[PDB]
Amino acid sequence: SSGVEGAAFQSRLPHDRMTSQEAACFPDIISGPQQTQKVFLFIRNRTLQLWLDNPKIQLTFEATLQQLEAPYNSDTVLVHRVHSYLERHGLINFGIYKRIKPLPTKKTGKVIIIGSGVSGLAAARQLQSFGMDVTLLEARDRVGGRVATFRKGNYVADLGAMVVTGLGGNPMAVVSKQVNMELAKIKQKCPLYEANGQAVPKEKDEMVEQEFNRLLEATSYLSHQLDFNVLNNKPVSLGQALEVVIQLQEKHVKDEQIEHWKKIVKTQEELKELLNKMVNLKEKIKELHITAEFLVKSKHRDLTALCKEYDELAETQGKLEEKLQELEANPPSDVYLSSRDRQILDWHFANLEFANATPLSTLSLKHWDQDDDFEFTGSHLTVRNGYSCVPVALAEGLDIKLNTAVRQVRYTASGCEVIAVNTRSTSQTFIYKCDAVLCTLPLGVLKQQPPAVQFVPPLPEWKTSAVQRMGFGNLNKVVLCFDRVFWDPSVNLFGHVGSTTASRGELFLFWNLYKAPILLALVAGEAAGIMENISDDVIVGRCLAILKGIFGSSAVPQPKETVVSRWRADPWARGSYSYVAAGSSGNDYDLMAQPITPQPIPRLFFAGEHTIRNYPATVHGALLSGLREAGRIADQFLG
Ligand SMILES: Cc1cc2c(cc1C)N(C[C@H](O)[C@H](O)[C@H](O)COP(=O)(O)OP(=O)(O)OC[C@H]1O[C@@H](n3cnc4c(N)ncnc43)[C@H](O)[C@@H]1O)C1=NC(=O)NC(=O)[C@@]1([C@@H](CC=O)c1cc(C(=O)NC3CCOCC3)cs1)N2
Numbered sequence: 001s002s003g004v005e006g007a008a009f010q011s012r013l014p015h016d017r018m019t020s021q022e023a024a025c026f027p028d029i030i031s032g033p034q035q036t037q038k039v040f041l042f043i044r045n046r047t048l049q050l051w052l053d054n055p056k057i058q059l060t061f062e063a064t065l066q067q068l069e070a071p072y073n074s075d076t077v078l079v080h081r082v083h084s085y086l087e088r089h090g091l092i093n094f095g096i097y098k099r100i101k102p103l104p105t106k107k108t109g110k111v112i113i114i115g116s117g118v119s120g121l122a123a124a125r126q127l128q129s130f131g132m133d134v135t136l137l138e139a140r141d142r143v144g145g146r147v148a149t150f151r152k153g154n155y156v157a158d159l160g161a162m163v164v165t166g167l168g169g170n171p172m173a174v175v176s177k178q179v180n181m182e183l184a185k186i187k188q189k190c191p192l193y194e195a196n197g198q199a200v201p202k203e204k205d206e207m208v209e210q211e212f213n214r215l216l217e218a219t220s221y222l223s224h225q226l227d228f229n230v231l232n233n234k235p236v237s238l239g240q241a242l243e244v245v246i247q248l249q250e251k252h253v254k255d256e257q258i259e260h261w262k263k264i265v266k267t268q269e270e271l272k273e274l275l276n277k278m279v280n281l282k283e284k285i286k287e288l289h290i291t292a293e294f295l296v297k298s299k300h301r302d303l304t305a306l307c308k309e310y311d312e313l314a315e316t317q318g319k320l321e322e323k324l325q326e327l328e329a330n331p332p333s334d335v336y337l338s339s340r341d342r343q344i345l346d347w348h349f350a351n352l353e354f355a356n357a358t359p360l361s362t363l364s365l366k367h368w369d370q371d372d373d374f375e376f377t378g379s380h381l382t383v384r385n386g387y388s389c390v391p392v393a394l395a396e397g398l399d400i401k402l403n404t405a406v407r408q409v410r411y412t413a414s415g416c417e418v419i420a421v422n423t424r425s426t427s428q429t430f431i432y433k434c435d436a437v438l439c440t441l442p443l444g445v446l447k448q449q450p451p452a453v454q455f456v457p458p459l460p461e462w463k464t465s466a467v468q469r470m471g472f473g474n475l476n477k478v479v480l481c482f483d484r485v486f487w488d489p490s491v492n493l494f495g496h497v498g499s500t501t502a503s504r505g506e507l508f509l510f511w512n513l514y515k516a517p518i519l520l521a522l523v524a525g526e527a528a529g530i531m532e533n534i535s536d537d538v539i540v541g542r543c544l545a546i547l548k549g550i551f552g553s554s555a556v557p558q559p560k561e562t563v564v565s566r567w568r569a570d571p572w573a574r575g576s577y578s579y580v581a582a583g584s585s586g587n588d589y590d591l592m593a594q595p596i597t598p599q600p601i602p603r604l605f606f607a608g609e610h611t612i613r614n615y616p617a618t619v620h621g622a623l624l625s626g627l628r629e630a631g632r633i634a635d636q637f638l639g
């Protein structure tokens, strides 16, 4: 059955073997008769199926046992063990669902959670359902963090996370079902328009895209086959490696051109010298002008010798003017890419800078895509009613203190205290005592200088250096709400090709949710940081000019409503999301996940998108990170 096999896959597990995490929790199983290993795997896979088939209701141990078939419904103890495991690690009974057995009246252990984004909310729900006392401290006047939906009238647009990157294996598939989140496929077709507004023809678009793919592939070869990862005692950036590959392509074009020029010059020299000898054989004919009868025959066989010598040379001439005009009619390219072509290629680079939220010259060549292996399957989807329905639903029933900005975290062998100020009256402060702190502060806030939050005692060097090495990027959006659709409704995406390499990320991509009279323009790469220093009105004006160039200056009305994100300037984010910087690696994500112990017991815990090696810079990654920490905290305090 790919019923039960599907459940494992859907939970990011192999259907047919135990994980190292399972091995640690079930040592007796992995070291015992392999027969009972299969039994374990079936129970695990089937319990997952029971949960995934109906994630709106709590799946209890009882109900699991009553739905298993003989003889598995007789493995009472093993079923309990598997159920307890799946629940603790948040593989079942996560997100938001109806409880069957209500929450324990008295609570055990106190946990403060810093930040009320998806990671914080996910962890809170887990810890609460485990019977712990949980309070979330949130600096904004709203939950959700980098999930941030603009709503006004019937305009909905996402200023933060917007895309569910495939459902196959994605825990957001469960959450989606739970909160009745309407999801829609993104059509792939993305026509590009040049700076002057003219469509890039199919032919040219496909050629350039192909070159982009070859260039990326080449850097991958250089990095992972030829091990070119360090230069002049500096780790190589992806940007740097792309520049090298491009330079080699240009050298090859120049070589082929030179070889061609040398063939032409050779042929021209041959022609010039054959003319010369044919001009001399002509002077030798001019000058050619014993019985009378034998002189005639003699000066006959003389010319026929000279003439079938010359006619012979007019033929080696013929095959040379031919070979020449074939050369000068079949040149190789004189450039690798034209000015125009390079601009279009820059569109593809801008697109990559968007995905990674940073200029390519900052990305680690070796590690930038270290998380490729863990991509989900299925089409990428958008959220029709706005992504914020997820954090809003996850907040239901939780103790969340809004407008409460944490400034100090103290942790000792005997417990912790967290100091926060009200962001509306920075006079009044609060002190919250607890057994454990879960820090979900964005990497951007952890990097902040001077610091936004003081840790007492200071975080150990192994942690701060990780914080310092890791990249934290930027990406912004301009939302344009119109009263009518003037664009093509069967297109979700279209691209604007900029005019310089440096500014390639400026308003390079426009996005529409179908029927919604809204366009989103993206600002990526070096442009992202710079354009935050421009007012909404000027940046809006620049969008309209681009759209006017494409659709006609008369087809584009003034927008009714606009919003512009400035993630870098936002004090509660300080950027958009992590990336693997040159000099960093996936190992730094693991370092970020590691709890601090002041043996004393661990007191300070870390969740957030920057703490999950396999799923960084995503909502699902934030969510999984929360589930992880909740599991570790409960293990520590509840056993
Ligand atoms: C603009 C933008 C776009 C995307 C994302 C982010 C942003 C900014 N994505 C990331 C996702 O949002 C984040 O990873 C998580 O939401 C982070 O959650 P965390 O819980 O880790 O962090 P938080 O910041 O939300 O919570 C922290 C809380 O702490 C509070 N706080 C700060 N300081 C405090 C103090 N002192 N005291 C108390 N509280 C304090 C803060 O207020 C905060 O609440 C994206 N994620 C996705 O899953 N999807 C998206 O769409 C992303 C994006 C990421 C790229 O990897 C993507 C874009 C695409 C895309 O466009 N692809 C398509 C191209 C066309 O073809 C189809 C596919 C794909 S993914 N976007």
Ligand SMILES: [Mg+2]
Pocket: 211, 214, 215, 218, 249
């Ligand atoms: Mg190439």
Ligand SMILES: [Mg+2]
Pocket: 500, 501, 502, 503
């Ligand atoms: Mg420029």
